């Protein structure tokens, strides 16, 4: 059964063709020379024959690393065709040297040129000898045959993102690596079918940058690399391009910590007790330091807050003072009486006000100096915007209540939507947001930092899962409300809903149903809310079954699926925990390196020495030879780093590899050709 | 007579047949051979459950062959020839039918499919999410106008605009959201009738709901016809749709019965159980839940919620097995608790009996009530004083409280955590093939919108067509292509080139890239 | 690097033998 | 587009230098001895030449485990 016959394998070789191809396989120089010289008097051989699996004589010699046979075959004018491409793809430097100077079916997509394929292989010798000839690589655009176009763009981006080609070309390999990683990251969004591939390419670029910066042997040279165009400009550029590995390089972090302390030799050899005491000490006198920087910003103490760690401590202390003021705002000992519309704000709120104004001013300055796109990329910035909007609402509502409600009356008799009541509500919400803004100050801590960053990195999966849960919630709310809205009850009870001792109507309105099904997932909804004031046991049973199915779906199915997805997320997230945390800590640290934004918010709003000169003039709009010297000195540094990188990760890393079956075949072929020579010459 | 030799020989001649080299040297169409052979090996992994693993592995290998034979395409015209081989996209539909997930999820297939998914929207990759959102809401908002144009003038510059798969997907989604919003309005006291009315004489909202219900039933009937009844139930969403439409049919029938048997009106509190109107409201509410859950299937279209929704659907089978075990545990403890407590069933005093009451009285006095008590015990909604009786029998109460406590230990701190553990193991593997499975599901969803049939949304689905009687009367009245050969040869040349490339690039070079042994 | 060493030993052996006969 | 040119790869080898480094690669003791003895009468070879990726003749012999060539090179 099933007789087996050859299909789509047309060509078969004659005995002479097999003998000659076998001679080329074995390395037999004498037999190949003989068969080739017998291929010109009376041909009868088809010098360019093709074995099974293709594998032409020239290509065979290329696969065997036999240069003598390659020179002979080229001397007898064989059809090279794609010989150069197979030589390059196999990283065969000698054959590439021979085929570069020598005067339908293919294994390569017709858009593949020699330089593109060489850069794909990342072999520095072949790329070097191709570039000297004068090759060029096409330039794709910013960011009829869709398959060919997408494949060609991928091929010329994989060539461009090659450490060897970036090292042989591209005046600044660092800028090229940054820009190319950014471009590939964007393309992994535009070309979502090849996303993975582009992402991998992007990742590769990032490591190149890191591994090009690991070749620094001196802190002066590393400082030159990082301060290239106020200061630390190239590091800020790396931050902007999201080069996490480049930033988290150990030498970068060491230099950054040295600039983070600036007056505190130690803090590594110091015991945690002295650290804690001195941080509390400086935090306690933050107002004095800020005052000195206000009045005499050049003294032995006015410059002390200019140090990034000191001013980070001062900002943290001012924020903790603010939060403690919010805590005092809810104490009956320093508040006014509740039976007062238009409260005429107390002392604590007055003291709170400068912090609020300073926070708003800081957020405005960030929104200006940095734009509005980069500003919202940080979620803490969105939280700050909501916080300050809520405080503005508090101030406005208090003002409105003061100029419209001059009378006092007991609070129980007040009417809903009273400006004072809404003011207290929005102020409380703003208090929650202000106190949550305190978790961002843990990227500075080496223990709570990686954890806080990783928890922030799990939120997106939580949001997707919560969107699915909201759909499930809406489905069951629709059903339960449809079942129960005919038995809405008012007579008797004086408090209606689920927020009452005897939980009455729970599915009688869509809003109330939504709350009931929300609080059901914490067990705060009793089982007797599924009853009605009638003997309708069927409707009650159906409602209890909707409610029970919702609890099964949400509490023992979806919740556990959330646990499973979180576990999968945290497996990967914890791998890049230190890298991401160090990126975040670098951002936090670098935010305290500038001269702007030095005073904490309470002192932020203080009329400066001029205070009108940069205020009036700001609205009134309606011979550096050091640059070239810096550029050349950076060029020498970069030359040395690229030399070191090529030596230590292209020449030695390639050597440290694992030899495949092709290496055994090459060894066997060398032994066989040696054998044939010796036997034939004696 | 010799089971060992027979099974081993069959395995040996299936492992030979499922060989990329042998499929490339023989088998006029390697694609059809790979599809059929993967299907056969998948079935044998069920029949021969002792060698299951092995057969499954073989099946998997076949699938990759198909994928890796399609990765050898260098042109979109040649790939189109491969996929349109026998209306259109026939070979891709065949791959869908044989469950060739890797072949379907090949990047070039997906690129071609997306190009056919948009058809009027150059961009949508370079466009910002804001413009996308605005234009989808815009087209969804005027879905009725587009459907009307396709009704009256299905050849104009606007009648053909709904013919585009993405546009008609947006139109169907908009009609479904309109339906769900109508169900939401159905439970508002501002557009409903009074509760003290038997035989409600359906209101305006229910009247507007009716065309959607009829269109949904008609769509489900057409799917059950054009596709058979075996492939139809393989999709679980189809079973959910069948239940939904059965429930809506029950709602209509019960409302009709109540209208022709209960012409009087009386307060609802005095109604009797099993009243047709009450049952109508109950089944309508259940159907509302199912209709609103039918909205999660429209997330396979989304690249963010799609892989997640598919993976969550892929964990359900383990949940079902675990819940079967839990139901046995539940039945065991229900039997025990009912046996202990059924002598103290109490009626005097209380007016509401069971656990659904403020003071939770008899909770283990009947088997049904015991089942409910033990079900709600796992959410903490059953109080601890239901284990007491009206007697001083502290021994029976203690034994009952110990049964109840052992059931809570087994279910809430043992079985539930075992479920978490099994789910974690499942999701480890499931998330590996997340993109492949999601892209298969999205291809199915997309391809369902490529045909001319089923273009109008359900409210407009039930509209007498221009003829409307010609294909209705005639349907029941039963009781020289030389392009074919040319297409076949052109496909043969394409296939020759792909097999040549595959042999060159994965048999000759992949073998070379290996690791030399001793 | 071990394959490269082996190939180099074979080549040097080859050159010696060919050069001494 | 994107014309590609060599940067920061200054030094390139003459034909004699490539021949001598290739001889050191292949292990050719006779060729290396000849080129080194021809590197003292009329040098014209730059005995300490450097290949791409560095990889000097002595370093090449070190990477090839060739002790004979190493002794010869040190002898010169
Ligand atoms: C270890 C925890 C296990 C969790 C419990 C498993 C349920 C086992 C069956 C319990 C039956 C006992 C009660 C019998 C009496 C009765 O009628 O009671 C029915 C009970 C409560 O009703 P009553 O109190 O009125 O009797 O309700 C239910 O039992 C509903 C259970 C439905 C299970 C649904 C699971 C499907 C998985 C969800 C898919 C995920 C995505 C979905 C989103 C779209
Ligand atoms: C961290 C969570 C740990 C969970 C709790 C562990 C239980 C520890 C022991 C508690 C004892 C304290 C109470 C002592 C007084 C008393 O008599 O109280 C007994 C309590 C409650 O009874 P009372 O309220 O009447 O006193 O009941 C129990 O303690 C029952 C516990 C039994 C544990 C069973 C575990 C076996 C694992 C299940 C196998 C899985 C599959 C099974 C399906 C077939
Ligand atoms: Ca901010
Ligand atoms: Ca269906």
Author numbering:
A (entry chain B): 17 to 119, 135 to 174, 187 to 272, 284 to 676, 694 to 753
B (entry chain C): 187 to 272, 284 to 676, 694 to 732
C (entry chain A): 733 to 753
D (entry chain A): 17 to 92
From the paper:
The architecture is typical for the canonical TRP channel family with a transmembrane region (TM domain) where the pore region of one protomer domain-swaps with the voltage-sensor-like (VSL) domain of another.
To be able to identify CaM-induced structural effects, we also solved the structure of TRPC4 in its apo state under the same conditions as for the TRPC4-CaM complex without the addition of external lipids. The overall structure is similar to the previously reported amphipol-exchanged apo structure of TRPC4 in the closed state. The hydrophobic residues of this helix face the transmembrane helix and the inner lipid leaflet while the hydrophilic residues project into the cytoplasm, giving the helix an amphipathic nature.
